[PDB]
Each structure stands twice: as C-alpha cells, then as structure tokens.
Amino acid sequence: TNLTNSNCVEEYKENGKTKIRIKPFNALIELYHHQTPTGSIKENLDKLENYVKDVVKAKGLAIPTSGAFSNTRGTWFEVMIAIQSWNYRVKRELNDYLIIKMPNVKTFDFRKIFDNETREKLHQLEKSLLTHKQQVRLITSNPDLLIIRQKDLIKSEYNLPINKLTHENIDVALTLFKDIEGKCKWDSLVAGVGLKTSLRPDRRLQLVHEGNILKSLFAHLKMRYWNPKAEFKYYGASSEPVSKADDDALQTAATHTIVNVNSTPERAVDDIFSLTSFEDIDKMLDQIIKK
Amino acid sequence: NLTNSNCVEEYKENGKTKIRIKPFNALIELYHHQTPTGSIKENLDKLENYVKDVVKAKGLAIPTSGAFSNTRGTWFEVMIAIQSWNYRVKRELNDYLIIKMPNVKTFDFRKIFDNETREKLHQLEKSLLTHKQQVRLITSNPDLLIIRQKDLIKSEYNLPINKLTHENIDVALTLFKDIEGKCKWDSLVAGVGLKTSLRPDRRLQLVHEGNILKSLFAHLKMRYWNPKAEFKYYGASSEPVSKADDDALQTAATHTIVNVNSTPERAVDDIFSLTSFEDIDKMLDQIIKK
Amino acid sequence: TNLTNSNCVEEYKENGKTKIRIKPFNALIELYHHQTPTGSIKENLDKLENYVKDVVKAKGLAIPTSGAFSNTRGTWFEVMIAIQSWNYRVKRELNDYLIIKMPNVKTFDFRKIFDNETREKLHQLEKSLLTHKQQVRLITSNPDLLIIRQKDLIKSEYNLPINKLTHENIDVALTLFKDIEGKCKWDSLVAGVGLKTSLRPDRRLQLVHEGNILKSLFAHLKMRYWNPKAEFKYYGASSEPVSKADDDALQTAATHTIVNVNSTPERAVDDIFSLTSFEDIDKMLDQIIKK
Amino acid sequence: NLTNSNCVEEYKENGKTKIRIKPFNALIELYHHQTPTGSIKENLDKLENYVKDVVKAKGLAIPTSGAFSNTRGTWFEVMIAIQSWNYRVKRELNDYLIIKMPNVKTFDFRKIFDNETREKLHQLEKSLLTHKQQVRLITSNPDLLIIRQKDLIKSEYNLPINKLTHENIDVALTLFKDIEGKCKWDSLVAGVGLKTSLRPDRRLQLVHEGNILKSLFAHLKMRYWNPKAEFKYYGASSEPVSKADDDALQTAATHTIVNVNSTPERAVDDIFSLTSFEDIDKMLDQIIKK
Ligand SMILES: [Cl-]
Ligand SMILES: [Cl-]
Ligand SMILES: [Cl-]
Numbered sequence A, C: 001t002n003l004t005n006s007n008c009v010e011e012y013k014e015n016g017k018t019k020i021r022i023k024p025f026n027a028l029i030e031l032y033h034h035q036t037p038t039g040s041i042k043e044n045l046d047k048l049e050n051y052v053k054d055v056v057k058a059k060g061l062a063i064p065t066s067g068a069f070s071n072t073r074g075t076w077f078e079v080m081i082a083i084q085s086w087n088y089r090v091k092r093e094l095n096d097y098l099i100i101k102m103p104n105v106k107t108f109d110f111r112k113i114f115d116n117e118t119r120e121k122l123h124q125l126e127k128s129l130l131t132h133k134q135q136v137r138l139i140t141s142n143p144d145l146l147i148i149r150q151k152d153l154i155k156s157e158y159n160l161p162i163n164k165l166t167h168e169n170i171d172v173a174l175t176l177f178k179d180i181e182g183k184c185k186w187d188s189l190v191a192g193v194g195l196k197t198s199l200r201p202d203r204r205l206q207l208v209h210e211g212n213i214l215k216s217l218f219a220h221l222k223m224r225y226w227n228p229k230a231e232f233k234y235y236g237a238s239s240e241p242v243s244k245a246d247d248d249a250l251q252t253a254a255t256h257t258i259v260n261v262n263s264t265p266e267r268a269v270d271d272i273f274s275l276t277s278f279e280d281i282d283k284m285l286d287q288i289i290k291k
Numbered sequence B, D: 001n002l003t004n005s006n007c008v009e010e011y012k013e014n015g016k017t018k019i020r021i022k023p024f025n026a027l028i029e030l031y032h033h034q035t036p037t038g039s040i041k042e043n044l045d046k047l048e049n050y051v052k053d054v055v056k057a058k059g060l061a062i063p064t065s066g067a068f069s070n071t072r073g074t075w076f077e078v079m080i081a082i083q084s085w086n087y088r089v090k091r092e093l094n095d096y097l098i099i100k101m102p103n104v105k106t107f108d109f110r111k112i113f114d115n116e117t118r119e120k121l122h123q124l125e126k127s128l129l130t131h132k133q134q135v136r137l138i139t140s141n142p143d144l145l146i147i148r149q150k151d152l153i154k155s156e157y158n159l160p161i162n163k164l165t166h167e168n169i170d171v172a173l174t175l176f177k178d179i180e181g182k183c184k185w186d187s188l189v190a191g192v193g194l195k196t197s198l199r200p201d202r203r204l205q206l207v208h209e210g211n212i213l214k215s216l217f218a219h220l221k222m223r224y225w226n227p228k229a230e231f232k233y234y235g236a237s238s239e240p241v242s243k244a245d246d247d248a249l250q251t252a253a254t255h256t257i258v259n260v261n262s263t264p265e266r267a268v269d270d271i272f273s274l275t276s277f278e279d280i281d282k283m284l285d286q287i288i289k290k
C-alpha cells in the first residue's frame, strides 16, 4: 500500500544532476509503527533493504548502488543495537547501568564522557608522549557499545521502553552519550564492545587492537588513581557465527599484561559473541553485566 | 614462448577450473641474467603485465585483481629479500643477517631462539594458558628480521645473488632454516613489516605486529634483567607515505604506557617509502646504524 | 665575666624539689653576640658545654647529667646546621632554594609541606593499604634537612644573613617549615639529609631505612603524576669521619628499585658526608644542590 | 666445680686481660640430660646467673651488662634453633627444614641457592655494581630460614636432640652447610628474625631485613615469571609485644608501593612474643600452615 509514497528515499540535485539518497530512519519508522525489530537481525535488515528496493521501483528511480545499501544496513544495525540495549536495561531493571551506542571517534570521542579530573590525566599523558625528540602519540578509538555503571547518571526518561520506532526515540537512543558528557567517573565504565559484520581477518584484527588500546589506557588510569580493583573488559560481537579458529585467535593476550609478573593475565578481547537474533543481544549483555 | 611460461597455472579445485599465479616462476623467467633494479613499481608492473600477457597467450582465465594484489606483495617481499641479501654483501656487514621470514603457519617466530630463551617463553606461554580463562601468546613473523650474531654467518652468505634462479631464490627464502634454534634473544636488532600500501588493514597489521614483537622482547628484557637490549620494529610501503598515515603510525606501544619507568615508544619506530631498490639500501642503512 | 649571671641554666621546682634545666638557646646567644659559629663543630659544641659547666659551678648548682648535656649538644648542633644552611643559600645566591631544618615527625610531619593535591594522593594510598584483612601501614619519618626548590616560596627576609645569634633569628631558622606548609609542589623537593652523630650500626641503619622509605614514597608519587623526570635524592651526614666499611655499606640498593628492570639502579642513600667543620656543611650542600 | 666451668674465659687482647663469655659451654654445662623447657626468660636468667656465679668463683672480672645482653641473644637464638630441630621431628614435617643461619660474615644468604638462581642474582649484582655510581646488593641472614624441599632431608635430621652437647649443638648450627648451593629459589617458605626485645634498633633490624629479603624474592619472582611463589618474613621477641611496636611493625614493604598490581604487604608479616618453648611451637605452627 502506497510506496510511490514512501519517504525511505529522497531525490536531490547536485550540480544540476538529480541524485537519490536513502533515508534509513524513515525506513525504520515506516516499517516499525507498532513494534520493535524481533527475531532474525539479518532478516529484519533484508526486509528493510527490500522495502527500500520496492519503493525505488514503484517510484521509477535510479537504483542505489550496493554501497549505498551496505552503508544503510549498518545504520539500521546501529539503531537495532541501540534500541535493544535501551529496552534491555529497562526489562532487566538495571537502574544503575547505561548501555550506550557510540558513534565513531571523530563524531564524538568517547573519552569526552569522562569527568575533568580523568581527562586532565589523559591529556597530561598525551603531552608527555608527544614531548620527545621522536614523537609518540596516544591514539584511541570508540568501542561501538559502552556499558557504564553510575547511578547518578540515570534519568527517569531512560526507564520508558521503546515499543515502536519514531524519529524521536531513535534520535534519543543515538545521542545518549551527550547526556553523560563529562560526567563519568573513570572507573564507572565496565565494558566496551566492538561490533563487527564478520570476523574477516581485518575485522578480527580491529577487535584485537582496539582491546589492547582501550585496556592499556584503563590500566594506565589504574596506576594514576592507584585503584587496583577497577576493572574494564572489552568484547567483540560478530554478525556471523564464530568459528573455533577465530575464537582461538581472539584469545591473544593483552600485550601490556606480559611485561609485569604482578599483572593478571588477560586477553585483549575478553570474549567474542555471535549476534544472530535480537535475543543474542540480550544474552551478550547478560554475560557482560554479570553472571 | 609465452604459451610456454610457468608463471601461471590452471588447477582443478573441486568442480571448476581455477587459475593460479606462480610468482617465483614469473621472477625466474623475467630475471635470468640480473636481479631487479630501478623502480620497484616498474618491476612490479612489468611482472604483472608479463603474467597477463602469458594468461592471454595461454588463453586462460584472468586472475582476479585481488589475486594480483596478493602476488604483487609476494614479489615486493621477495625482491626486498634479495636486495637485502646483496646489501649485506656489498656493505660487508659480516656480523649481520637480514632474513626473510615465511608466514606464521610456516615457521613460528620463537623457533629462532636458542634453548635458554625458548624455555623462558614456553614458561610464559604455559602460565598464560593455565588460568580459568585461557590467554594465549600469539606471535607473528615480521617480513624481515635483522640479527647480529657473528657465529651464525656462513661463508656462502657472502656470495651475491647476481641472477634470479629457483635456486638463488631458495637460499634466500630458506635462510631462516639455518638459524632456527640458534639465536640469542638479544641478537635481534629489528623486524620490518613490508606492505604494498598503507591501506587501513595493512597499516593496522604493522601497528599490531610492532606491539606483539616489542612486548615479547620487553618480557625477555625483564626475564634476563637486561635494560639495555634493544629491539626496533619498522614498516615499509611501496607507495608514498601520507602525512596522515605517518601520524597514525606514531601510536604508542601499549605495553609502554603502564609503567612510568618505561621509555615511551611507538609500536612502529619508523615507516619507509620504498620507491627504488636504492631506497631499500637507504632503509637498511638507517635500521642497522643511524 | 659574670657567670653567676648566666641564663644558660635555670632553676625550677617540681613537687617541691628544686631541679636544674639547661637553656641551650640562651647559651648560644650569650656566646654568639657578635659572630656565628666557625671552624670545628665539635670545638664549638665543647665550648658551649664547658661554658654551661662553668656557669653551673659559679652558681654552685647541682650538675646536669651527661644525658642532659648530650641532649643539649644535639639542640645546639641542630641550630648550627640550620644557621649555616640559612647563610649558605644567601652567600651562594640560591634565590630559588630553601634548605630547611626539620624537627621530628611527631612535632611536624614534613609531608605537611606538600600541597593539597599531593597530600590527598598519599592519604588515598594510606587508606588503600589500611583497607586489607591484614592491615599494612604507610609509616614515614622526617629527614633532618630538606632541600626545596620553588621560587615562589622565597621571601625577601630569607635573604638577610645571620651574623650573630639572637632568640629571634634562631626561632626563625627553626620554624621555617611553617612558612611553606601546604605550599610545596611534590616535585619541588630535591633532597633530604639524615644527620647522624656517628655511623654506629643503629645509626647507619636509620639512614638506610629512611632513604628507602622516602625514596619509595617519591617513586610512588612519580607514578601517580606520571612524571618520570622528577628526582629525589636522600643523603646521610655523619659527625665523625666516614670509614670505607661504612661507605661500602651505604651503597646498598634502594629495595624498590630491584623489582622492575626499567627503573634506574639507585642507592637507598645517594651519598654520605662527614661534617667536621662548618665549611664541610657548605661542601655537602654544594654537592647536593648541583655539581 | 664452679672454679672448673668453661662457660667463661680470660684472654689477653693487647695490653689488658679481658674476660669473655663462652655461651655454648654455658649451655652444655647447664643442659646435660635435657634440653631447655618452660619459660625462656627463666632459662636465660638461669644461664646468666650461672655465668655470674662462675665468674665470682673464678674471681675474675664481671662481663659488661652489654656483653650479657649479647650472650643472652645467642642463647635465645640457639635455644630456638634446638626447639625447631625437635619441632620438625615431633610434627613429622618430613619435607621441611628449619635452619639456623650464622651471621652474614660467616655465610652469605645467597649461597643457599642452587646454580640457576645464583647466576640470576650474580647477574643482578653485576649489573648494579656496573654504573657510574656503584649500587651494591647487600643481603642479611634471617636468624631462621624455613624451606620446603623433600630431596634435602637426611634421615639423621629425624633424630631428636634430647641433650645439649658440643655435638648436638654443632649439627644444629651447621645444618646450613648441608643445603648450601642446593635450594631451589621457590623452596623458601619464610625467614624469622629473633630479637631479645623490640628495642628501637632491633625493631628496625626486623623491618629492614624483611624489606631486604622480600624484595630479593620479588626480583626472583620476576626473573622466573612465577607470580605464585610466596616468601614471608617474621619477627619474634622474648618480651611481650606492645601495641605501639606492633603498629610500627605494620610498615609497608617499600618495593610494594610502586606498582599498583603489587599486592600490598608488610615488611614483617607478623610478630611473635615467645614466652615459653611452647610458644616457639605455636609460632612455627602458624608459619608453616595457618
Ligand atoms: Cl532518514
Ligand atoms: Cl581525554
Ligand atoms: Cl589520584
């Protein structure tokens, strides 16, 4: 029913030529006026894709490249993760936890969620490193998902579940990091998750390096604040089943932990998850938060 | 002629007839009476087009561009290994060895160490694997490994490779076999990762390997209580190095930011853009003493 | 000339019995109305002693025990060290340095000279240690002499030399630590000196342990503030010549420096000095401040 | 009788005729058909007065109170060494050895280690001594050293010392000779400093020795990469322990406050007040397993 009428695609001109752009968020709202995504993640994504593909055809428009689509599925996946996480802390009644969907480091460096005291220590570290004949640099990135535990960060609005997608609750789920900017105590993060389409070599390596970068950063903070009990775990979540070969490889030791006999041995990536269904998201978070 | 080349093959995997490039034969065929010189890119293209010509003459399927990109890497790596072999000779660096390493599956890095060091590592490795959650020590092989240990030099290493033959190619690609189980840990001078380009994935491979190799070396420094032993890791690109990539390659070695007494260092000490074969010499000149 | 008139001794009653107390400071003033102590330290001390002994005799008073005298010589030595140090920074024109004579830890814990930021880190360390099934405790002591470098701590009054002893300039030299309480940046201390009557076993051991206690404390601060360049040296100064046997023994490595291959090897006591003449005090300080 | 004792001597140093107590003869003489029991203080006084009586009968000079205080320490130490010998036997602790160590000048602590460990320490020691300003590794001997290594136990260690003879005393005071160069580093369980009192100087001796021994052990843990090896150091007083002294003995081991991953620990893990010989057993019971 009336597709030449969908808004999941838009025409626009650039240099007098007409181009077509997909509108991922309108696609979501249009297909989720009464429920949130359930069952197979890949199935919900294929549906959204085909939906946009049907709308393009009914409008007799130029068809978007595989690229445009591969990118849109990512934006949809990001929204799915964010929404599920938002409803997870609600149904699990985790009043002291925030599971935030983070954008890329250039959009909003997650480090900005840290309070002033913590950021100054990291800034002092950076300045220290960059002050050497041969320049060394502290380069960090953003985990796709952050699990934070700090009761005072919880607003009552966060406790209302999302039963259907709207421009408003989607925007709120994707800009949650803005509410806690500069408010997080360094030891309030409990974990970070790197979400990958698959464990293809390059993507598996990204999990490994990111885990080393973030965990060592936290280890540095533990020495600055002299808090041996502070803990930060880093996880990986693949959209494809995980093979033993990849699982084996994701057992690699965090490099900063093999130079001091007093540090507990630990992997760069504490564990790897396979997300097929939305329930797999809840299961992953269950293992991450506790038990 | 071209219908007779061996630089390309046709095999029957299960079902279809898949084609496969024979990188070393391409080399032996194009370099009969001399080793590659001048522009590295020129030689890579030359080798590439040669294959393409052969494939046309054979009237066989064209190998995928990805397949070419991979074979290009093998050629890049091998040609650099040959330069290094000859470099050691013309520079008369008797005590040094610039060894081309195979991939991890072919030969595990640790195997180069003598017994004293292997035992220390196996000990670190077993302690790791023995915890409620297993933590493994996974290592990688740097494309090139420079070591200084006088007693490992054979007189035949002093014979330059003036021509590429299935044989000159083998002495160079199996040189690592001669030193297996014989390297004192502090004999290692540096490792070098060779990439055709600093494409995101390849750049990260350099960053991780430097972290992997340097941390292991830092562990051994602790074990032997030798603060002075030094091990550097470098990267090399066949393409020019952008200011951006260079900045990304300044990333601090993670095991370096946990103790204030640690001299802060990069995961990759320096990146080199190898345009000509002379640039290879220039790189080695800096790596071995600058 | 008129001793039955000296004030270097005082009578007082306690429980209806009359007792005699030496007044070390009056002895100093009375014998240094026109000059500060010079030449042999032991000679200046013996003189002061005999002086008080002559005054006791001229007053026909009960004679003070060896103890009372051994204690008074210490108070005199403390004043001598303090005065010499005060004139040293003046004649050497060290406008950014303060060489302070410190009392015992119970009178005024030297740690109180540290700014708030530094003291909180140490308090957090203490609380951390004392919070274990088996209680561990951070117990520090006071070096007898502190060399501090922080320009903003210098007052013009400090730049007036002391040409003769008075109740006023002696009091100022012995309470200098009060002017800088809570004002010192942790990395502003450059050194501490433990002053010993001799290197008798127990006294030599005190230098060794104190050096380990203070240097490790500073090493802890270097990790908290992430300043690898901050330096703190600890020295010993004996009032007797130093034998090779004792010098050898005072080469013992600071125990906290032998567990990490990345830390520079260092002695618990960086060097030992022999103070015979007042010039030996200047020489010691010269080696401590620089060159 | 008393004019015949050998517990006291008269020697001609240069010039005068100085007297000298013979602590072991005092012991052999007072304990012919049984080892000391009951109150340690009682036995110390007994031994002391015995000497004093002998000195009177000999009509010789009275040794200084300081000299007595020192001989009191030797007796305290020795009697505790004998209890321990017998303790190991009655408890049937086959794998343990409770060794009385001589002073550093007589036998350097390190000498108890096997070759592998001595080499690691000599290496640490030479690296230290080789710097612009020499830094030495000076060690001390804990009065008692408890070790667990089954292959060092001789059947004759299982023979209790039922009487004090120049001979039972020697097996106990030379037991350390049997294990020289044979102790695996992680065979060390604990060390114990024995003081007649917690007088400031003696208290500090305990604090320093614990710092000295524990740091050395922590170095070896690093070298062997064995986080689990454990070494504790204890103090023991013949006098009761005041709340104040106990608090002073809570001082943190200095090598423990520099790395946040270090479990925080005391220089001296615990202090014991040995009033009776039974208290010695009680102490050993806690030290060996609690
Ligand atoms: Cl949209
Ligand atoms: Cl920051
Ligand atoms: Cl802090």
Ligand SMILES: [Cl-]
Pocket: B021, B022, B023, B024, B025, B026
């Ligand atoms: Cl081939």
Ligand SMILES: [Cl-]
Pocket: B223, B224, B225, D120
């Ligand atoms: Cl070794």
Ligand SMILES: [Cl-]
Pocket: C022, C023, C024, C025, C026, C027
């Ligand atoms: Cl007075």
Ligand SMILES: [Cl-]
Pocket: C111, C112, C118, C119, C120, C122, C123
């Ligand atoms: Cl404080």
Ligand SMILES: [Cl-]
Pocket: A121, A224, C224, C225, C226
């Ligand atoms: Cl800080």
Ligand SMILES: [Cl-]
Pocket: D021, D022, D023, D024, D025, D026
């Ligand atoms: Cl004797």
Ligand SMILES: [Cl-]
Pocket: B120, D223, D224, D225
């Ligand atoms: Cl080992």
